[PDB]
Amino acid sequence: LAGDVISIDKASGKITKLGRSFARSRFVQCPEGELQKRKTVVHTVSLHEIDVINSRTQGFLALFTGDTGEIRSEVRDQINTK
Amino acid sequence: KETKEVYEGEVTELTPEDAKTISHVIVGLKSAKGTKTLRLDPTIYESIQREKVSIGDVIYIEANTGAVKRVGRSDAYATEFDLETEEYVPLPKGEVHKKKEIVQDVTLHDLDVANARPQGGQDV
């Protein structure tokens, strides 16, 4: 709606509602500076996560359910070489 | 000893030909070095319709395996709307047709695993 503060990713199309602006008539400050921003995000992904994702038997949800179930050594070697 | 063959570029022509069953698919890709027009069997259109490929989408086609990957739309259609859900990739500076000789190192256990999936196969 009007007055909402949102963040838009142009590629994936994800729109996140950060809240409402400071208007009496939850509450988040209005963003400042540029609108189309280019920011650097930094990721640290463990080798076990790439092991689970590269394993074709189970998806990335096994990082949370915990049923990875004896990931094979060829996936480990492929992850090491990559 | 296997051969990797890759067709990539912006789609400038996507015209099917029926006989409700598609017979052959004419696809004209475009890169910075020129264009290339290819016939295609209906299985690649099944993969393309899976990938919702339209005119102007820079795509990736492997000739031997039929793998279709949509990189995104081109910058020529980046100003059709001021704000758009689509992502925009530049025109590839290489040629449309790329050939490569690569070496596949597999083991017998890999083929045993791939031939004995207990539930079934999975997509790429």
Next chain:
Amino acid sequence: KAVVIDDPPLRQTPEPFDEQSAYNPQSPIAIDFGSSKLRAGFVNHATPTHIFPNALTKFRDRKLNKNFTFVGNDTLLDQAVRSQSRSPFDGPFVTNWNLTEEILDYTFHHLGVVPDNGIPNPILLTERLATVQSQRTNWYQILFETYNVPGVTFGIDSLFSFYNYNPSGNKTGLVISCGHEDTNVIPVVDGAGILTDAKRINWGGHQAVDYLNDLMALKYPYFPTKMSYLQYETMYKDYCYVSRNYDEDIEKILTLENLDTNDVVVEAPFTYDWRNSILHLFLRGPRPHDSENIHEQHQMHLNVERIRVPEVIFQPTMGGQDQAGICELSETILLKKFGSQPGKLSQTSIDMVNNVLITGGNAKVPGLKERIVKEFTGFLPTGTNITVNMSSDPSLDAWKGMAALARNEEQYRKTVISKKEYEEYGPEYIKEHKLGNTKYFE
């Protein structure tokens, strides 16, 4: 480094006259009635004999002689007379014709012509592509009732330049003409200009210099002095080029490592850091600016306008025209026309690709040839041989066109229209030859 611009210099040497002994009465005469410059001379010569701008003034004096003979190169004598120049062209067409009568009398007097009962030489005249009927009827009127010429031919200067660089007369090629007031793409099949599929962009050199004038007036609204059209003409001529790829070039014009090389500084003739500020880098370059001195208060910094002005012939939407660009029009001729599927080139469409001709007076800008070749590679299939032809001077090749038509090939009389043909057909007569116009209907 500051570069001082000024008014263009004046030719203090007066123009000469042709000898009367070299006058031949049955020899034809070539006249290129351009919107910017007029090229006149006799066909037997190779180079044109008279190059002068297509304008004249009406001088006034305290002795009250009312002399108005300052025509063409006579205007390049004093600063006061040059400001009162008056071309007969408003846009692409001519609005007043007695002005053209004075111009034609001037160029007939300076070519060593001593006639009787009108001009006895057949003229070789150029006309605009798909010109209006009224201009053609008025041209017939002036040519056949004020000068009484034996024969008239009509043609397009782009097709004349194509005939000049393909003198066989049956070649197949593509002509791109960058004129003064319009830009034309004309495909030629077997020596015949196919004018039912030619296209015209409403943009030329004059519109480009006017666009640069408007851009520079918008960039510095508080500039103390006002510059003339010739000054903007010389900045368009000297400090403009076609970018190889506009999208990647415009991404980094304003960067600091690029602004110290290709940004020029123009000085008007008279007698909280700024590193991350885009507006100051655009306005005053990569140097710090202070506004207390009159020396740099008369300063321009053409940076984006070095590539923005020549890009309008490729994107006419920037100049206000809802028209396709040069490469877009070139793509739809030889990929979606003339029996050519996109992806499958016909044999005719191959032949124009090997015979691309770029001509016109506005082809003088650098980088136009490489941009055309690169863009032609983009839509054509791989392996197609894109060969372009560009003259050393693409302005005088139009005069060499009718020089090589009425002299080299004896089928020039296949294109002439006699005075007796004018009586039996009228002012609406069109002779559908290869190098000229066509009828308006089917």
Next chain:
Amino acid sequence: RLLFLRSVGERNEIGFPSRFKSAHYKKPTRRHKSARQLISDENKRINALLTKANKLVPKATYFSVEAPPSIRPAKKYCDVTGLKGFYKSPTNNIRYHNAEIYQLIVKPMAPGVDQEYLKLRGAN
């Protein structure tokens, strides 16, 4: 410095009964008929010819030779600097490049300046 103009003045004197002209001269009275209305009465002459002949097809006229508008979307540029115009102000309908340009030029501008900024691309 002033006699040069007189020297080229009666150097090139051509009289009213000029020998380049014919013996019969008979110049008629002609109106102005500038660039803007020649297109219009040629247009209405062509439409009168089509309506008279129908109630045939033209081949190469002044309007049939005109280039059509493009089918690819035009790139949007900043109206102030000519850079890549990401944004566009909603009040004065002026495209701009970044925040500094909007705060300095686009927002605090006089009325009527925007209508001649838009006159360059003809959006007034």
